[model samples]
Target: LYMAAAVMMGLAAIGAAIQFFIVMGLVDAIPMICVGLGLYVMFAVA
Candidate 1:
């Protein structure tokens, strides 16, 4: 039981690290996209 728990903890740590990097990049791109769209609309209206 203890060994299983240890292995799971290790895996969970790795999963968390991988998810953080993947999600961080998506989060960064979302703001850039919104800014680009905002500029597009401003130009279209003008």
Candidate 2:
């Protein structure tokens, strides 16, 4: 579960970073929200 969370967050960071460069807008926040939810599940549900 920890590994899954780590990978999910890592990919989220990479994806958001890429979108950040290309879009340059708050839309990149979507990935961060997903990452946040992933963390919540990891700690609260795992």
Candidate 3:
């Protein structure tokens, strides 16, 4: 039981780290993408 909990905690920590980056990338890119598309539209309209 003790060993199982240790292994589970280790795996959870690694998984959380990976998930954090993925969420961060999406959070960072989504607004930039919106801004990029807006820019494209502005140039296209002009």
Best by lDDT: 2
List the pairs of residues colliding in candidate 1.
none
Per-candidate Cα lDDT values, in order, are: 0.32, 0.47, 0.33
lDDT of 2 by residue, 1-46 (tens): 5246544643453345334465634434354456535543454354
Per-residue C-alpha lDDT of model 1 across residues 1-46, encoded as one tens digit per residue: 2134223322232223222366744443232244323332233334
Q: How far does residue 5 in candidate 2 sit from its true spot (Å)? A: 2.6
lDDT of model 1 at residue 32? 27
Please estimate how well model 3 matches the true structure, expressed as its whole-model Cα lDDT. Answer: 0.33
Error of 2 at 32 (Å): 2.7
Q: What is the alpha-carbon RMSD of candidate 2 to the true structure? A: 4.7
Can you tell me which runs of candidate 3 are displaced by over 4 Å?
1-31
TM-score between model 2 and native:
0.30
TM-score of each: 0.24, 0.30, 0.25
How much is 22 displaced in model 3, in angstroms? 6.6
lDDT tens digits by residue: candidate 3, 1-46: 2133223322232223222356744343232244333333234334
**Candidates, ranked, TM-score:** 2, 3, 1
lDDT of 1 at 38: 32
